[model samples]
Target chain A: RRGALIVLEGVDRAGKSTQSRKLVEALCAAGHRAELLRFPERSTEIGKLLSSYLQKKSDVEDHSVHLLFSANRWEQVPLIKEKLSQGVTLVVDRYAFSGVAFTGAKENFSLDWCKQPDVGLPKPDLVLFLQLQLADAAKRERYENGAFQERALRCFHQLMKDTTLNWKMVDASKSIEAVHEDIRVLSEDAIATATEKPLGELWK
Target chain B: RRGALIVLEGVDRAGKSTQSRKLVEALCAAGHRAELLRFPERSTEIGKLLSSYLQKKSDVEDHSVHLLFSANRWEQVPLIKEKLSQGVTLVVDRYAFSGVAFTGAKENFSLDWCKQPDVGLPKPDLVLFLQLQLADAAKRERYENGAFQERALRCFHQLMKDTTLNWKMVDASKSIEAVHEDIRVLSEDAIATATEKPLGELWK
Candidate 1:
């Protein structure tokens, strides 16, 4: 049996990072081989560039920075495939969904153009979007400027309608344990279902 | 009047570097504001990653590396437009054409996929091709493996059919001065014609 590719996506304050770690821990505690993987991996050649851009330590044109984020993911495809094939469930902190939302929020950008570089990535079995209101998302550390966050939120809502991805929404307003319980249940079910099927392609 | 964006492209040993420098010098000596630019600029954050990949200091996925090369170009679009708008002709040593050829030469890579990241870049007013045979190209330093060179050469030929680019052929077997003369004449004419015209977009 293979592992499920589970992705957690949301704007800031959505508890994506916190819950992603917890999900992996719970999955392993239950005897599943689960691992955590985050985007803009921040260690490789491509990641260093991305980290610099994100930190404003360097300046990059918007399109170029967006493509670098895509490249960071592309560089890890082989490892990702290997882990999945080895029955290691990947709890991805973010995927191309966030890449599209954040970059597409910029002026003069299109969601279609932003999607091109990441078109063929490995599709996740389940995309768990931690739903939050703009007011809640704003209170988090490292939050984007208010208007930018609003645009990105709109993009996220737009992505939920994408017929290709199987999206599941969980309320981020719940307690940590309450939210983790919902995510854990969904992830366990997803892992069970994905094992019997072939791995799917993203944005095909 | 805006200045021309002139690009020189070909496989190794075609003296693209020598000709590009000479053309810029010739333009400046003739009282034109011309500058020499080369791809994988090797200084910026994006360029350092490209340099690492190209120098074998780091391993990058084929697709990721190709996008990085495209990002390198995209990062320079503002500067390129500024110089052109200020009437400073740019003699570019290599650009998207080489990025497409080198990366597309790999197994399982389509030229179309390779071209996607670079779509809508600043189109050149003149793309001067430094033509050389594979056998001659191999005698130069740091040429690709023979088979790879052949594939890239074929890609270069395929690009010439693209009706949108104003591609001119120059025989590299000729003396350096002869090649420079051809390139110089073409640049002058291109500069003149493009002066009254709007700059074109690449790959639409």
Candidate 2:
């Protein structure tokens, strides 16, 4: 499509929200149509269940939850594509990278298996990884333990090496202005280059 | 070592519940500790979301629901493993065969991909396929469409042929007693023979 699907990848509090919002605002101010997106959208039927799951309000099997995360993305495909084709750049907070990496971090949740469900869904034009120390992240109720975060970090490492997924890492430990500036420059370049290529699929 | 992990496979109204109950009763009468199991057990966390998805109370992405089905079974691994080792035969209503077949029947959900989540989980000693014509099944409120059922049937057929999974077929159109008899006879042979074989993993 003519629009770029730019995604930000990081653990919680890695500034995905702030950076995504800043990038979208920058794209808009620069006369670009920009939209913000996130997985487990939590507004639709599937999203509500996923919200309950994330909040620990409900329990879902790992495999099932993984698929739901993938499904949540699939439901957004037509819209995502339509927006991109309409010249809207999507500043996504997260995507399949986090889905697979986070879920695959758990035992019995194989990384290879976790990656399959999202295959053939829309591919992101650029993936920006915000690097951070697990200790620095505020402790959430879940996936906040040192061991869990450490393992999740390993999973992200595996994801970057796993394929030619066009993943780029940024030093998020830096100041917000520096990180945002780096992302803004890269995203503008990506939007320019990817505008001509057709929309891609996950794990293709 | 004394118990066999016996599974029943079929589309809806394929007499899974009826025959499973009968087989378990017969096993009990025959002096074996037989426990009945079903996927999307709904009592567990993953099962709860799966139930809402199945009941159409909430929407779940297909891949997520598919994995949930597998997760429901995976969540029971220790229980199933413990029961089998402790001289309890598990008369499971649905297992990975159904999970893969039913979910894999859909578009974008390949059979190869669908089977990944449940891989390495407990494999059944004997799998009884309750064969039936879709027309013979009553129209249930959920998943009652013929096309969906037809697709699921073909998935089962594929499962039976594509793997060395020890799947056996039974014409469920027959009377309950006749079907129960066939299952009972095969179950006896399976129990007798499986006592010496260690429990296997799915899709191994």
Candidate 3:
């Protein structure tokens, strides 16, 4: 009876934002209760920290930055659970995937290492990964300027092979509409089956 | 010629908070400009997320939680840099050490893995570690009920030996005033040396 947790994950400029928005709109039009949440929401206290980091206004220690990012998602757990319990489907732009991919790109940290803190949190019923070539991503956004984005992309590639959860990879090099359509069909199928089962638990 | 970044690290009951406060006060009393910054500051958006996580109101995935924590610190880098550049002393209660220790305690992640995301982050000129035995920590307020605190203590012990930063271990079992005195003397010596140098570029 609980709502499903769906996550859309990809590197910056993979068109995840637009596609997620469209999926949310489609879900709403179908008379299903759905809401969108973005990582680095930038609206809460944690988001502000992420904002400052992205803007390069501050110099955060590496370990601290990683924890702060994880904390951002922790803060949203209650709302996510509540919305799902209320029968509202939750659609997230970025989630654990970004966490793994971005942090995994760093040396000394591996995908399994990034997956540890997330163990006990809520698990998404379905994870939609927007896959894009590094060249494609560079052409689409300002991500080419930073070494961090490239690291994130590399991490994303590894995540596809890791496969510890329900994951679907969508080619993001296509047009926005096509990407949205792909996500829409995949999500609809996932939602159709997910509601009949118990919510997925993470780290358990 | 950059100023040295100083970080104070420990478990929740290790007296890091109190000592960091005292160190900052001592800096000011000695006619120096000093600032104290805490992780999960709760004033910014990202901090709100961290607060929610700590308070158990939200459920964040482990990886997401890690990144949020890192992002929180990232947000503070600029201010930390600017203050140090202006010859102000910055005393941080918890930095990458906490990030590493806490996540490392989870055991799902390795310490080295947790250390990766922060590689390019500003390295501390000095990392003052407040070392308290588990028995001593249990006598402090509020840590009595949590098994996790004990795990954190074990992790802290290991980190003290394993980390690459400039580490100074403080015996936290001593009286608060005595601990403060010890930190004061050490901080004074470090600050004196740091002041003689110009502000160094972070992540250089």
Best by TM-score: 1
lDDT of 3 by residue, A155-179 (tens): 7777667555788989999998888
The list of candidate 3 runs beyond 4 A from truth reads: A57-59, A107-109, A138-143, A146-148, B1-204
- Give the DockQ (2 decimals) of all models: 0.76, 0.33, 0.28
Give the Cα-based TM-score of candidate 3 against the true structure. Answer: 0.59
Q: Which tens-of-lDDT digit does each residue in B46-159 have in candidate 3? A: 677778777778866665666666666767777777877777777888886677667777857776656654545566767888877767777782123457777766777776
Question: Which tens-of-lDDT digit does each residue in A10-105 have in candidate 1?
Answer: 987799999999999999999999999999799987787778777777777988988899999998999999999998999999999999999889
Model 1 ranges off by over 4 Å:
A139-143, B140-143
* Candidate 1 global lDDT: 0.88
Model 2 lDDT on a 0 to 1 scale: 0.82
Model 2 per-residue lDDT tens digits across residues B14-40: 999999989999999998789899876
What overall lDDT goes with each candidate model? 0.88, 0.82, 0.74
Which ten contiguous residues of candidate 2 chain B have the minimum total lDDT?
Answer: B136-145
Let me know the DockQ for model 3.
Answer: 0.28
Lowest lDDT sum, 10 consecutive residues, model 3 chain B, at B195-204
Q: How far is each candidate from the true structure, as Cα RMSD in Å?
A: 1.8, 3.3, 7.1
* iRMSD (1 decimal) for each model: 0.8, 3.4, 5.9
